[PDB]
Design a protein around this nucleic acid. Structure first.
Ligand SMILES: [Mg+2]
Ligand SMILES: [Mg+2]
Ligand SMILES: [Mg+2]
Ligand SMILES: [Mg+2]
Ligand SMILES: [Mg+2]
Ligand SMILES: [Mg+2]
Ligand SMILES: [Mg+2]
Ligand SMILES: [Mg+2]
Ligand SMILES: [Mg+2]
Ligand SMILES: [Mg+2]
Ligand SMILES: [Mg+2]
Ligand SMILES: [Mg+2]
Ligand SMILES: [Mg+2]
Ligand SMILES: [Mg+2]
Ligand SMILES: [Mg+2]
Ligand SMILES: [Mg+2]
Ligand SMILES: [Mg+2]
Ligand SMILES: [Mg+2]
Ligand SMILES: [Mg+2]
Ligand SMILES: [Mg+2]
Ligand SMILES: [Mg+2]
Ligand SMILES: [Mg+2]
Ligand SMILES: [Mg+2]
Ligand SMILES: [Mg+2]
Ligand SMILES: [Mg+2]
Ligand SMILES: [Mg+2]
Ligand SMILES: [Mg+2]
Ligand SMILES: [Mg+2]
Ligand SMILES: [Mg+2]
Ligand SMILES: [Mg+2]
Ligand SMILES: [Mg+2]
Ligand SMILES: [Mg+2]
Ligand SMILES: [Mg+2]
Ligand SMILES: [Mg+2]
Ligand SMILES: [Mg+2]
Ligand SMILES: [Mg+2]
Ligand SMILES: [Mg+2]
Ligand SMILES: [Mg+2]
Ligand SMILES: [Mg+2]
Ligand SMILES: [Mg+2]
Ligand SMILES: [Mg+2]
Ligand SMILES: [Mg+2]
Ligand SMILES: [Mg+2]
Ligand SMILES: [Mg+2]
Ligand SMILES: [Mg+2]
Ligand SMILES: [Mg+2]
Ligand SMILES: [Mg+2]
Ligand SMILES: [Mg+2]
Ligand SMILES: [Mg+2]
Ligand SMILES: [Mg+2]
Ligand SMILES: [Mg+2]
Ligand SMILES: [Mg+2]
Ligand SMILES: [Mg+2]
Ligand SMILES: [Mg+2]
Ligand SMILES: [Mg+2]
Ligand SMILES: [Mg+2]
Ligand SMILES: [Mg+2]
Ligand SMILES: [Mg+2]
Ligand SMILES: [Mg+2]
Ligand SMILES: [Mg+2]
Ligand SMILES: [Mg+2]
Ligand SMILES: [Mg+2]
Ligand SMILES: [Mg+2]
Ligand SMILES: [Mg+2]
Ligand SMILES: [Mg+2]
Ligand SMILES: [Mg+2]
Ligand SMILES: [Mg+2]
Ligand SMILES: [Mg+2]
Ligand SMILES: [Mg+2]
Ligand SMILES: [Mg+2]
Ligand SMILES: [Mg+2]
Ligand SMILES: [Mg+2]
Ligand SMILES: [Mg+2]
Ligand SMILES: [Mg+2]
Ligand SMILES: [Mg+2]
Ligand SMILES: [Mg+2]
Ligand SMILES: [Mg+2]
Ligand SMILES: [Mg+2]
Ligand SMILES: [Mg+2]
Ligand SMILES: [Mg+2]
Ligand SMILES: [Mg+2]
Ligand SMILES: [Mg+2]
Ligand SMILES: [Mg+2]
Ligand SMILES: [Mg+2]
Ligand SMILES: [Mg+2]
Ligand SMILES: [Mg+2]
Ligand SMILES: [Mg+2]
Ligand SMILES: [Mg+2]
Ligand SMILES: [Mg+2]
Ligand SMILES: [Mg+2]
Ligand SMILES: [Mg+2]
Ligand SMILES: [Mg+2]
Ligand SMILES: [Mg+2]
Ligand SMILES: [Mg+2]
Ligand SMILES: [Mg+2]
Ligand SMILES: [Mg+2]
Ligand SMILES: [Mg+2]
Ligand SMILES: [Mg+2]
Ligand SMILES: [Mg+2]
Ligand SMILES: [Mg+2]
Ligand SMILES: [Mg+2]
Ligand SMILES: [Mg+2]
Ligand SMILES: [Mg+2]
Ligand SMILES: [Mg+2]
Ligand SMILES: [Mg+2]
Ligand SMILES: [Mg+2]
Ligand SMILES: [Mg+2]
Ligand SMILES: [Mg+2]
Ligand SMILES: [Mg+2]
Ligand SMILES: [Mg+2]
Ligand SMILES: [Mg+2]
Ligand SMILES: [Mg+2]
Ligand SMILES: [Mg+2]
Ligand SMILES: [Mg+2]
Ligand SMILES: [Mg+2]
Ligand SMILES: [Mg+2]
Ligand SMILES: [Mg+2]
Ligand SMILES: [Mg+2]
Ligand SMILES: [Mg+2]
Ligand SMILES: [Mg+2]
Ligand SMILES: [Mg+2]
Ligand SMILES: [Mg+2]
Ligand SMILES: [Mg+2]
Ligand SMILES: [Mg+2]
Ligand SMILES: [Mg+2]
Ligand SMILES: [Mg+2]
Ligand SMILES: [Mg+2]
Ligand SMILES: [Mg+2]
Ligand SMILES: [Mg+2]
Ligand SMILES: [Mg+2]
Ligand SMILES: [Mg+2]
Ligand SMILES: [Mg+2]
Ligand SMILES: [Mg+2]
Ligand SMILES: [Mg+2]
Ligand SMILES: [Mg+2]
Ligand SMILES: [Mg+2]
Ligand SMILES: [Mg+2]
Ligand SMILES: [Mg+2]
Ligand SMILES: [Mg+2]
Ligand SMILES: [Mg+2]
Ligand SMILES: [Mg+2]
Ligand SMILES: [Mg+2]
Ligand SMILES: [Mg+2]
Ligand SMILES: [Mg+2]
Ligand SMILES: [Mg+2]
Ligand SMILES: [Mg+2]
Ligand SMILES: [Mg+2]
Ligand SMILES: [Mg+2]
Ligand SMILES: [Mg+2]
Ligand SMILES: [Mg+2]
Ligand SMILES: [Mg+2]
Ligand SMILES: [Mg+2]
Ligand SMILES: [Mg+2]
Ligand SMILES: [Mg+2]
Ligand SMILES: [Mg+2]
Ligand SMILES: [Mg+2]
Ligand SMILES: [Mg+2]
Ligand SMILES: [Mg+2]
Ligand SMILES: [Mg+2]
Ligand SMILES: [Mg+2]
Ligand SMILES: [Mg+2]
Ligand SMILES: [Mg+2]
Ligand SMILES: [Mg+2]
Ligand SMILES: [Mg+2]
Ligand SMILES: [Mg+2]
Ligand SMILES: [Mg+2]
Ligand SMILES: [Mg+2]
Ligand SMILES: [Mg+2]
Ligand SMILES: [Mg+2]
Ligand SMILES: [Mg+2]
Ligand SMILES: [Mg+2]
Ligand SMILES: [Mg+2]
Ligand SMILES: [Mg+2]
Ligand SMILES: [Mg+2]
Ligand SMILES: [Mg+2]
Ligand SMILES: [Mg+2]
Ligand SMILES: [Mg+2]
Ligand SMILES: [Mg+2]
Ligand SMILES: [Mg+2]
Ligand SMILES: [Mg+2]
Ligand SMILES: [Mg+2]
Ligand SMILES: [Mg+2]
Ligand SMILES: [Mg+2]
Ligand SMILES: [Mg+2]
Ligand SMILES: [Mg+2]
Ligand SMILES: [Mg+2]
Ligand SMILES: [Mg+2]
Ligand SMILES: [Mg+2]
Ligand SMILES: [Mg+2]
Ligand SMILES: [Mg+2]
Ligand SMILES: [Mg+2]
Ligand SMILES: [Mg+2]
Ligand SMILES: [Mg+2]
Ligand SMILES: [Mg+2]
Ligand SMILES: [Mg+2]
Ligand SMILES: [Mg+2]
Ligand SMILES: [Mg+2]
Ligand SMILES: [Mg+2]
Ligand SMILES: [Mg+2]
Ligand SMILES: [Mg+2]
Ligand SMILES: [Mg+2]
Ligand SMILES: [Mg+2]
Ligand SMILES: [Mg+2]
Ligand SMILES: [Mg+2]
Ligand SMILES: [Mg+2]
Ligand SMILES: [Mg+2]
Ligand SMILES: [Mg+2]
Ligand SMILES: [Mg+2]
Ligand SMILES: [Mg+2]
Ligand SMILES: [Mg+2]
Ligand SMILES: [Mg+2]
Ligand SMILES: [Mg+2]
Ligand SMILES: [Mg+2]
Ligand SMILES: [Mg+2]
Ligand SMILES: [Mg+2]
Ligand SMILES: [Mg+2]
Ligand SMILES: [Mg+2]
Ligand SMILES: [Mg+2]
Ligand SMILES: [Mg+2]
Ligand SMILES: [Mg+2]
Ligand SMILES: [Mg+2]
Ligand SMILES: [Mg+2]
Ligand SMILES: [Mg+2]
Ligand SMILES: [Mg+2]
Ligand SMILES: [Mg+2]
Ligand SMILES: [Mg+2]
Ligand SMILES: [Mg+2]
Ligand SMILES: [Mg+2]
Ligand SMILES: [Mg+2]
Ligand SMILES: [Mg+2]
Ligand SMILES: [Mg+2]
Ligand SMILES: [Mg+2]
Ligand SMILES: [Mg+2]
Ligand SMILES: [Mg+2]
Ligand SMILES: [Mg+2]
Ligand SMILES: [Mg+2]
Ligand SMILES: [Mg+2]
Ligand SMILES: [Mg+2]
Ligand SMILES: [Mg+2]
Ligand SMILES: [Mg+2]
Ligand SMILES: [Mg+2]
Ligand SMILES: [Mg+2]
Ligand SMILES: [Mg+2]
Ligand SMILES: [Mg+2]
Ligand SMILES: [Mg+2]
Ligand SMILES: [Mg+2]
Ligand SMILES: [Mg+2]
Ligand SMILES: [Mg+2]
Lengths: 117, 150
RNA sequence: GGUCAAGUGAAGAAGCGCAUACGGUGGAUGCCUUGGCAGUCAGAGGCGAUGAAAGACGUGGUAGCCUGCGAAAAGCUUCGGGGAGUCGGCAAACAGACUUUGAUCCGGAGAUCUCUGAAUGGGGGAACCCACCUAGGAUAACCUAGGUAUCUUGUACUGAAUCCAUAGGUGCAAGAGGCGAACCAGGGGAACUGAAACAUCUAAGUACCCUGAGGAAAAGAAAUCAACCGAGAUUCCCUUAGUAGUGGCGAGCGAACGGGGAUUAGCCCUUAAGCUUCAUUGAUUUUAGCGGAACGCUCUGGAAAGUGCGGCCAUAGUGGGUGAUAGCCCCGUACGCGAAAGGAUCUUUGAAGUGAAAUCGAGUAGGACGGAGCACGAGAAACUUUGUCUGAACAUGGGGGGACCAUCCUCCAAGGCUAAAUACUACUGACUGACCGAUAGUGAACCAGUACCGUGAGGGAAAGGCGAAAAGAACCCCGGAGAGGGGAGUGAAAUAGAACCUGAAACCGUAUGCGUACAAGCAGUGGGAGCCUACUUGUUAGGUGACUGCGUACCUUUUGUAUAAUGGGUCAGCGACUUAUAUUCAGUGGCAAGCUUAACCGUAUAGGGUAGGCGUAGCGAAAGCGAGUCUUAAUAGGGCGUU
RNA sequence: AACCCACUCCCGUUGAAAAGGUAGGGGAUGACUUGUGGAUCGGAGUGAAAGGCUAAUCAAGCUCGGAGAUAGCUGGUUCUC
RNA sequence: GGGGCUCAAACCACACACCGAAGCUGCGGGUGUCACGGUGACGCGGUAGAGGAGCGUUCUGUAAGCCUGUGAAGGUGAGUUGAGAAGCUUGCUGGAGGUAUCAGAAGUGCGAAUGCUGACAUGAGUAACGACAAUGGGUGUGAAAAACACCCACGCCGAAAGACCAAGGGUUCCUGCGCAACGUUAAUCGACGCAGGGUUAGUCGGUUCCUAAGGCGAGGCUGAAAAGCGUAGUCGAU
RNA sequence: UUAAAAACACAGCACUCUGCAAACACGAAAGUGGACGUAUAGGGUGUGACGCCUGCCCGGUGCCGGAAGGUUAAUUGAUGG
RNA sequence: CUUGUCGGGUAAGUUCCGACCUGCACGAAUGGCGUAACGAUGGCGGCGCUGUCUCCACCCGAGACUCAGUGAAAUUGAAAUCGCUGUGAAGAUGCAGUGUAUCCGCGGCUAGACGGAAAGACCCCGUGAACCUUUACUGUAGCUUUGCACUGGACUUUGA
RNA sequence: UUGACUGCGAGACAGACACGUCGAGCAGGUACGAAAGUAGGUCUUAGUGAUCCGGUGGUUCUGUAUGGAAGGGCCAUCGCU
């Protein structure tokens, strides 16, 4: 029983070369270079699911700082004031109100201020 | 493999990978690494393990109603159509016929019949008893299984 | 609306990137096969001086090569078969013919059979040169047919030193010589390697070289083993047993007795079985052939063997191929018949020969020295054999029973012949394969031991596929009376067009969409505007990716590599833990104080065969004793073992 | 001078050439040079001796066998959880 | 680390707030072990290495089955399903084969070995085009002329770069017809392709006659065998 | 085929061996060379035209001569156990 | 030691020539000391001559350069392939910080890519290999001693 | 005066193995001491070398047809800078 490798080997190389679509030069058309490019792309994607959550908290916090100082308060003093009174609203929701619903953000900043913080 | 007695090139200095023979298994026309030789595939089965499987098969054939017992089964003159009519009375098409001794006439018929085999008590193996849809046995052959199989 | 100023900044790509669509190159993959590989069952096991194996040259209606033949040259004569086409293939055309008054074709027996080659009349650089003798025929400068090597054996004649007769010399007959894959019996005989170095030892009496024989060979009928009971020639298989031994007692080597089988057989020197060669008596096979059953309609289709419906044959039903898948279309198959003439085998009965050595074994048995062989390496070392040197007895005698002696037992050496069971396959036929399928399988599917390489010995490739059928593209146009194309035709299909099935990847292009000329690095990824396309007209799908956060390839080797340490230009194909025999442990089964057979028979995967192996008892170095035993003066102690 | 040789420079070094070329150099009646044919070879030959030469190969030629020598050493070793 | 920093954005004390990991919590999934009868509990980084469970390829049985010209294998896109190796369904191409399920058997899975064979890239349209005797016009032919033929001039060799024997080669010789490949460019030309033709001996050279070095060598002598040496003899030119 | 030399050879010199079937060399051997030679010859070794010369040591290791004594092989086999 | 010391030659002489003797470590056929002629032999010094040089300039041919035709090679993981100062398998185009900088050719030069080429030849290791030496070990061809055989007769000396 | 004894040995310490170290108690025979008792060398820790092979003294073993013997086993002991 002699087994020939032609059909199975070709099917396996085409799966890798389809994931390497859009890469530059030999990274999208030769198997040896495209195999390493696909592995490193998956290494980056695993790490950047952690970094996506970090990059978005930093963006919300920076926008909350800009909106609070327009009402006479810094970010660190507003967070302490919110925790003092009641509020559990996310940084994600807070950054949305700072840009879109500016009259609601002012009310929250004014209530956090009234907690003497 | 023929040829390949000498080194293709000297060991050092040519800038090529080391070679000792052109008939290497890594080369195009070279030999097979673990080439085969004619060997035997034949296991040992205990005499009693063989009989225990026959008892197990025959017991299951009765439970599944795939065994038909008749009082003697003989035909006169070798004619395939003579046997086909006889088997049609019992309503069997794919059948194994077991008798205490294979008659010449019954062997000459059923030789060209497609899904019919005529065997003997000592000639019927575990595979044939499972392969066919029905087994036809005579009372004289049933007595013969009891002596052989206890 | 005008001028001025400040701000802002679309489009415009020499060329590149990604995506998609079409091509090109290239030849993978799939499917296929006139070629290989390994077996089983048979055959017959040699050819050659009556000229072999192997060749050169020639031979055809027309050039070459392959096949066949040999100046009578793809053939001549006879028998036997058949039953209409034929003049071999690559490889086609044009011609000339052959014939039911029997061709081509197949088988048996004949005839012819150049030159070289053991090559054989003498030479020689193989395929060439030069001769002599006899018989017959021509008259010119020869023709035809036979002879002429060497050695051995036998025979006839002849005859040196030398009288005799010896060596020698001529003539007749008979034989040999050379080739061949293996098997067999002999002569000569390594090393690498292992011993984790290496001398003894091993590898191994292997590889290799040489010489003889045969279809087999060799060996074979006890001066053999056993053990006080017996067996009964030789050969081969399975066990005894990796035991007793042997061994720098290292690495290693390794029996026999006794059992189970295959085969069956002995006969002579007061002259036999047997074997050869003739002549006869019958039978059987081989070399060629002959007969050999049973199907129609319908649908799709270029074409049915496929769909649907109904039948028939069977000692013939998973054969091959026919326009796609056929028991009933063809060739076949089961089953029946067959041979003018050769071959072979077995069978009667007649002859000739051989066996054959004459008369029971003397330079023999035994011994001393040096070696070889026995599983046994000098060892307590028996036995066989012999290079050197010696050397008996005569059946009230001689050999052996592992130093040697005694007693018993058992054989009769120095003379022969003998089948079967056993080994091997270069070669021929049939059948088979959980073998390969064109980088595989033979090096070799194809004009391969070729092309090519080397002075030579020698080494040694690449290279398969149109289509069912050549129906292989008449004719027109561009072009050099080209190459190559555009039409037209053939075809089911020419993007099946001869470099012809399918036609992947690397690699190279054309077209369209988006991006790219102030911007620094493993080229990706998290986020993300804009533009283009499609339709569900935007919580959608596809293509691009301005800008921005992070981010120094893979393998190996290492304490540690982005490492400026190793490896890789890329693609496609191939490429590395197997098999046999002995074992131990685990899982899963069958039997169970028992379990299981090996060779071998076989009604052949059944059944038989229980010789043997393991278990049911241990202790001791052993004799031995035994649920005990060893140590010891010791039923004390202790070691090992026992429910 | 021819002929045999090979002292120097340069060029060439992927060469016109796997040892050459141009310009100079030595011997040139002799222990000379050369054609044809022949003899000696692998632990062997030959050597006015360099371990030189024996078919571009020499501190032991080439070829085929033992033979898949051996390699405590480098390299490589192929799907998934 | 840079910009920049002086009642600091330095240093010494004290205080309160915030940011900040794949740590912890929240929400949704998957798995290992143990206990109970699907729940509870705590685990789930990993090289050498040990243990467990699987995917896919070829062949054999199941299979005289089932699928298939209303289109098999293969190739090329799209969609979809699993934790993965992978599976499934379809458009186009292709034109005749494939193998469900569960078992059995392996030439069973490549990116590396300065791996082997074939094809194709980069260098790059870059180096080079082989003695630095040397060429310029006219005419003809032809699809096309720097190179072919002829003519008029110019250069080079001439103890050769001219003639002739031998060795070696083997048709390269001459003539018609050609230009794909060969010729380091083109070619109408050629030592290239096709087809014809061409070599005439008593005196030339061999053969025949003779021998040298040397070879072979009837008998012979020697040697485990193969064989060595050699006499008569007979080969061997230079 | 990176070394042409001071390296090798050389004429001359000396030592030593060899009486001819020579010493010596190639050959399991037959035989062949030396040599169809014969000590003014042949082999080996060193030195190296020519001139003047070549000194001391015989303890070591070689070679040559001696044969009294000591040691000493195969072989033989008294004696003892 | 050492470029010993003295003399000569030069403006200046580790080389050269002539001496001295303290010969690390000359020496008499592995010859000692001389020697005319000879040498593509080693060292030193003069005359002539000069692009050897100060210090290069111009000119002539063959390449290089451009156009037409034909058309290689080693190399190569993939490249969107800058400087500096640090860091770091310890000497960075690729990492950190920072500075510069529109995109692409052609003619030149070689500072780097630890540039290409050849599994370092130096060095060490392997219970590796060859070949060479000898008073290493164990053997052996050859040469030589003696016993027996081929191999006999007689006489004499002499031991038992 | 010979306890520098003979057969053992509960139990330990050390320790990859092969080796090593300590030892109450029992049985035989002893020596000292009136006796309880002490004694299996020396105040302790170095003074050493495996297996193979060969030799010597014993021996309820074996002993290749049988009775012996040779040879082997067991116990004691000898031969390694
Ligand atoms: Mg394969
Ligand atoms: Mg992209
Ligand atoms: Mg963050
Ligand atoms: Mg965060
Ligand atoms: Mg062959
Ligand atoms: Mg070879
Ligand atoms: Mg190689
Ligand atoms: Mg090889
Ligand atoms: Mg090899
Ligand atoms: Mg091949
Ligand atoms: Mg092969
Ligand atoms: Mg192969
Ligand atoms: Mg059985
Ligand atoms: Mg049947
Ligand atoms: Mg472009
Ligand atoms: Mg593009
Ligand atoms: Mg593109
Ligand atoms: Mg036969
Ligand atoms: Mg014959
Ligand atoms: Mg011919
Ligand atoms: Mg011919
Ligand atoms: Mg012919
Ligand atoms: Mg022929
Ligand atoms: Mg004739
Ligand atoms: Mg006829
Ligand atoms: Mg002849
Ligand atoms: Mg002849
Ligand atoms: Mg004759
Ligand atoms: Mg002749
Ligand atoms: Mg005579
Ligand atoms: Mg013969
Ligand atoms: Mg043969
Ligand atoms: Mg022999
Ligand atoms: Mg033999
Ligand atoms: Mg022998
Ligand atoms: Mg050896
Ligand atoms: Mg060894
Ligand atoms: Mg070893
Ligand atoms: Mg060694
Ligand atoms: Mg040894
Ligand atoms: Mg030795
Ligand atoms: Mg041996
Ligand atoms: Mg032999
Ligand atoms: Mg024969
Ligand atoms: Mg015979
Ligand atoms: Mg024969
Ligand atoms: Mg015969
Ligand atoms: Mg036979
Ligand atoms: Mg015989
Ligand atoms: Mg015989
Ligand atoms: Mg008796
Ligand atoms: Mg008998
Ligand atoms: Mg040993
Ligand atoms: Mg036996
Ligand atoms: Mg027996
Ligand atoms: Mg026939
Ligand atoms: Mg017929
Ligand atoms: Mg028929
Ligand atoms: Mg028939
Ligand atoms: Mg068929
Ligand atoms: Mg078809
Ligand atoms: Mg059919
Ligand atoms: Mg029909
Ligand atoms: Mg007798
Ligand atoms: Mg004797
Ligand atoms: Mg002897
Ligand atoms: Mg012996
Ligand atoms: Mg021994
Ligand atoms: Mg005896
Ligand atoms: Mg004798
Ligand atoms: Mg005897
Ligand atoms: Mg007797
Ligand atoms: Mg005895
Ligand atoms: Mg015996
Ligand atoms: Mg006899
Ligand atoms: Mg045999
Ligand atoms: Mg046979
Ligand atoms: Mg193919
Ligand atoms: Mg092939
Ligand atoms: Mg091949
Ligand atoms: Mg050649
Ligand atoms: Mg040739
Ligand atoms: Mg048509
Ligand atoms: Mg197509
Ligand atoms: Mg087609
Ligand atoms: Mg087809
Ligand atoms: Mg095609
Ligand atoms: Mg492609
Ligand atoms: Mg482009
Ligand atoms: Mg821009
Ligand atoms: Mg700027
Ligand atoms: Mg850049
Ligand atoms: Mg995104
Ligand atoms: Mg989008
Ligand atoms: Mg992005
Ligand atoms: Mg980015
Ligand atoms: Mg980075
Ligand atoms: Mg970064
Ligand atoms: Mg690597
Ligand atoms: Mg390292
Ligand atoms: Mg290191
Ligand atoms: Mg370290
Ligand atoms: Mg790092
Ligand atoms: Mg790297
Ligand atoms: Mg780098
Ligand atoms: Mg390196
Ligand atoms: Mg690197
Ligand atoms: Mg390294
Ligand atoms: Mg590399
Ligand atoms: Mg292969
Ligand atoms: Mg078990
Ligand atoms: Mg069990
Ligand atoms: Mg006890
Ligand atoms: Mg116990
Ligand atoms: Mg010379
Ligand atoms: Mg010059
Ligand atoms: Mg010259
Ligand atoms: Mg001359
Ligand atoms: Mg002269
Ligand atoms: Mg002269
Ligand atoms: Mg001269
Ligand atoms: Mg001459
Ligand atoms: Mg010659
Ligand atoms: Mg020769
Ligand atoms: Mg040699
Ligand atoms: Mg030599
Ligand atoms: Mg020499
Ligand atoms: Mg030599
Ligand atoms: Mg030397
Ligand atoms: Mg050669
Ligand atoms: Mg050479
Ligand atoms: Mg050698
Ligand atoms: Mg071997
Ligand atoms: Mg070999
Ligand atoms: Mg090898
Ligand atoms: Mg190695
Ligand atoms: Mg090591
Ligand atoms: Mg390495
Ligand atoms: Mg390697
Ligand atoms: Mg920073
Ligand atoms: Mg303050
Ligand atoms: Mg905090
Ligand atoms: Mg977090
Ligand atoms: Mg966690
Ligand atoms: Mg949860
Ligand atoms: Mg964890
Ligand atoms: Mg884990
Ligand atoms: Mg199947
Ligand atoms: Mg279709
Ligand atoms: Mg398939
Ligand atoms: Mg398809
Ligand atoms: Mg088919
Ligand atoms: Mg299947
Ligand atoms: Mg394979
Ligand atoms: Mg293979
Ligand atoms: Mg394999
Ligand atoms: Mg494989
Ligand atoms: Mg790999
Ligand atoms: Mg690959
Ligand atoms: Mg890998
Ligand atoms: Mg390379
Ligand atoms: Mg390799
Ligand atoms: Mg590779
Ligand atoms: Mg390759
Ligand atoms: Mg290019
Ligand atoms: Mg360039
Ligand atoms: Mg250039
Ligand atoms: Mg150029
Ligand atoms: Mg040139
Ligand atoms: Mg002109
Ligand atoms: Mg010209
Ligand atoms: Mg002249
Ligand atoms: Mg001329
Ligand atoms: Mg001329
Ligand atoms: Mg000629
Ligand atoms: Mg030629
Ligand atoms: Mg011609
Ligand atoms: Mg011509
Ligand atoms: Mg012409
Ligand atoms: Mg043209
Ligand atoms: Mg050409
Ligand atoms: Mg051309
Ligand atoms: Mg040229
Ligand atoms: Mg021509
Ligand atoms: Mg002669
Ligand atoms: Mg001769
Ligand atoms: Mg003769
Ligand atoms: Mg002659
Ligand atoms: Mg002549
Ligand atoms: Mg030289
Ligand atoms: Mg010279
Ligand atoms: Mg030179
Ligand atoms: Mg010299
Ligand atoms: Mg001589
Ligand atoms: Mg003399
Ligand atoms: Mg001499
Ligand atoms: Mg001298
Ligand atoms: Mg001299
Ligand atoms: Mg000299
Ligand atoms: Mg001198
Ligand atoms: Mg002396
Ligand atoms: Mg003296
Ligand atoms: Mg003397
Ligand atoms: Mg000095
Ligand atoms: Mg001085
Ligand atoms: Mg001075
Ligand atoms: Mg000077
Ligand atoms: Mg001077
Ligand atoms: Mg001086
Ligand atoms: Mg001094
Ligand atoms: Mg001196
Ligand atoms: Mg002297
Ligand atoms: Mg001296
Ligand atoms: Mg002097
Ligand atoms: Mg001279
Ligand atoms: Mg000279
Ligand atoms: Mg001079
Ligand atoms: Mg000067
Ligand atoms: Mg100038
Ligand atoms: Mg110029
Ligand atoms: Mg151009
Ligand atoms: Mg150009
Ligand atoms: Mg830097
Ligand atoms: Mg740095
Ligand atoms: Mg930098
Ligand atoms: Mg980077
Ligand atoms: Mg950086
Ligand atoms: Mg970083
Ligand atoms: Mg440039
Ligand atoms: Mg340059
Ligand atoms: Mg550079
Ligand atoms: Mg460098
Ligand atoms: Mg380098
Ligand atoms: Mg290597
Ligand atoms: Mg190395
Ligand atoms: Mg050592
Ligand atoms: Mg070692
Ligand atoms: Mg030596
Ligand atoms: Mg020695
Ligand atoms: Mg000797
Ligand atoms: Mg003698
Ligand atoms: Mg004492
Ligand atoms: Mg005590
Ligand atoms: Mg006591
Ligand atoms: Mg007392
Ligand atoms: Mg030893
Ligand atoms: Mg006895
Ligand atoms: Mg004894």
């Amino acid at each position: 029983a002699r087994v020939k490798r032609g059909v199975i080997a070709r099917r396996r190389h085409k799966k890798i070369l389809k994931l390497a679509k859009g890469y530059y030069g030999a990274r999208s058309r030769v198997f040896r270079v495209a195999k390493q490019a696909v592995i490193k792309a998956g290494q980056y994607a695993y790490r950047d699911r952690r970094q996506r959550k970090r990059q978005f908290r930093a963006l919300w916090i920076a926008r909350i700082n800009a909106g609070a100082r327009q009402n006479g308060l810094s970010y660190s003093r507003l967070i302490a004031g919110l925790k003092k009174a009641a509020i559990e609203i996310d940084r994600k929701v807070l950054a949305d109100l700072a840009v879109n619903e500016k009259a609601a953000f002012t009310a929250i900043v004014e209530k956090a201020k009234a907690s003497l913080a | 493999v023929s040829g390949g007695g000498k080194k293709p090139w000297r060991q050092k200095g040519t800038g090529r990978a080391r070679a000792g023979t052109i008939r290497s298994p890594i080369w195009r026309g070279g030999g097979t690494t673990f080439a085969a030789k004619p060997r035997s595939h034949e296991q040992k089965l205990n005499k009693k393990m063989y009989r225990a499987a026959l008892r197990s098969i025959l017991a299951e054939l009765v439970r599944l109603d795939r065994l038909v017992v008749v009082a003697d089964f003989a035909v006169d003159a070798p004619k395939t159509k003579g046997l086909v009519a006889k088997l049609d009375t019992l309503g069997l098409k794919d059948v194994l016929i077991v008798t205490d001794g294979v008659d010449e006439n019954l062997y000459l018929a059923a030789r060209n019949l497609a899904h019919v085999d005529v065997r003997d008590v000592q000639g019927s193996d575990p595979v044939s008893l499972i392969a066919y849809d029905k087994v036809l046995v005579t009372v004289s052959a049933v007595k013969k299984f009891e002596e052989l199989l206890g």
